[PDB]
Symmetry: C2
Subunit: 393 residues, 2 copies
Amino acid sequence: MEITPSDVIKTLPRQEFSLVFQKVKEMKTGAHIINLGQGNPDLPTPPHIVEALREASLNPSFHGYGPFRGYPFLKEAIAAFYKREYGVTINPETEVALFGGGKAGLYVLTQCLLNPGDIALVPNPGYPEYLSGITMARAELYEMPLYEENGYLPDFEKIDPAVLEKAKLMFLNYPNNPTGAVADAAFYAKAAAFAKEHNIHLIHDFAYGAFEFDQKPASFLEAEDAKTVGAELYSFSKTFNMAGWRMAFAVGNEKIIQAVNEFQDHVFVGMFGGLQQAASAALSGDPEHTESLKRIYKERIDFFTALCEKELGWKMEKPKGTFYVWAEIPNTFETSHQFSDYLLEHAHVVVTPGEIFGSNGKRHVRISMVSKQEDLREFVTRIQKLNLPFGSL
Amino acid sequence: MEITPSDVIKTLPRQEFSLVFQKVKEMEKTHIINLGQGNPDLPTPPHIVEALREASLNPSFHGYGPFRGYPFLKEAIAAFYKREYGVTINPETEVALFGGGKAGLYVLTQCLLNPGDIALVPNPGYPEYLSGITMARAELYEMPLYEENGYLPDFEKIDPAVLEKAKLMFLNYPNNPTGAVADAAFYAKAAAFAKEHNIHLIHDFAYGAFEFDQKPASFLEAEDAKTVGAELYSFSKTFNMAGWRMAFAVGNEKIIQAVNEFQDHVFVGMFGGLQQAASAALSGDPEHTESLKRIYKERIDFFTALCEKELGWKMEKPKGTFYVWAEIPNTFETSHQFSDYLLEHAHVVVTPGEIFGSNGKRHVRISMVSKQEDLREFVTRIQKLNLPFGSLQ
């Protein structure tokens, strides 16, 4: 019989993937399911990015194989974006690697950085895909608990010094999926120093790096020692409404980037030059596009949380970043998975059960602000019609 | 200090990436004819480019798509395989999508081999077969492909004990680098062999459009082929879409399921615009491809005739692919010494056979990826060097 290696089905059950499947399966017809589960941007890519792709696709240079490591124009664009947005200086020739989206970036970084038997420090709650690369690398996982009281920042002192002896890699994610928590330059310097002291490679997942509402967002690479110990993964998916386009990059330590390049040389031949040109247009575009998108999300969050609170008494802290609301489940309901099933079956809305993000996600759900006002009001309206007590304590 | 994984320390550099780099440096210092990497010189056909351009305007593609790819492409893949090879493929269960064949090889290897498992790799063979086995932390047993056997493996010469442990075998016809072709009988033997020994069979069909006398046979035409394996098909050579990075696998549903369960966590599909472009390539009129094949055949006829006349370098015409596989001069020690020599002293690129395995040590591969007048200049550059093109084999 066909016998796949054991590790594949030893990865998390692709819950967003089981989510798209059950949803499509719910189709009188594709019933008006208000899907606030997956963080799938609802607004179109800015027309100037689309036009850069349309124009690029006519250039026959991009039809054949290109540079393995991506086009120098994109790497220079990424340098310029980082200087503009965060005042960081990046050497585009040695400190930049291209990826087919952030998911792909996390996987590759992990394979280049972790050996069997090493420990990887992973935040709980946190993005489930951190476990995927760790699993594929046959490495061990240690959870750093993220608690609300600490603004969902890790307490590095609370980690077993034995765990620390075997730790080779740590993941951090701010602005945070799923909690909406933000971090400033201060925490990044603290994190980088901890990483330096214990000789741990630091991967900062900056997928929502455009979306902090209560200050201009800080990059991990603004910290002292940041470029010595790690790398920052940046996705186009959220910043530019480009989730479909599958593009991302990492900036950081030239030695990490060299490992990435050596890996990717065997798996990829860069990526479609048309996509790279579109990426370049995104990065060089006027910051007003991204600022507008941040206002859209900030107003949807303001609207949703105020409406949930007024009408349902369902209290939610306003996130300071990302487009996610991290809501405690009312006491009327049982576990996160049972609550999420219930909402989908009875109202016809999708939220993501918090347990997906780790055991500290118990009794929470993640709600993504990826719909306009009417859809968000209707979500609350459909809940209100359930006639269950939703009030918080 | 920054310490990369042992996997990365164990990986040899990709020769094509090394040449890209050397060629670029040489060009900057001031003209190279590159017949190394199999990089099509002709642009992507217009109807494919236009399909992308128009699809890029569809905002449904701007957001996350189905993780396993759009059903419309999968359906196109099934229709294509029926029209071209008379093979029945279930578009819902027997098709997976990849970011290029190179990425498909990686994924397939990760999905079919545990660390420690044995893979049967042809020698000579496409360099990434070896790379993937390394990245999988697997062990390789060579299957020698000898000229006298038409560069087909002799399965009955493989130690039956290795077959108890062998989990995977790679085959590739039309063959890179040798140009050898395989028939339906060969494929029925391979499948039967794989079934007896419970070996997963991956057929690399990258040159499936380019067999000159006949349309090549698909592996999947064979009895029990879909029972033991899968076939990898690339858009790169068939459609001058190398820079686009698109490929698929067709085969048994369990192999495909494993691919899907892997890729869910690493590759969310690719941009729908690309998928539309692909679908247009496959539904496109077969005579565009037939035409392309004839161009390559005329280049091969021209080049082998000119090399014989002008250099005295006698080469067999390949049965398929756009590659010529040629013995190096009797005065040189190795294929790498010869390749480096040509680059330095003639300013032309050929690929050293040694990167395909030890059986390529006295050969170079030459790609017919320039027009006839450029092929002529390539010959005239070499002619000035007065090399001895005698055989020792």
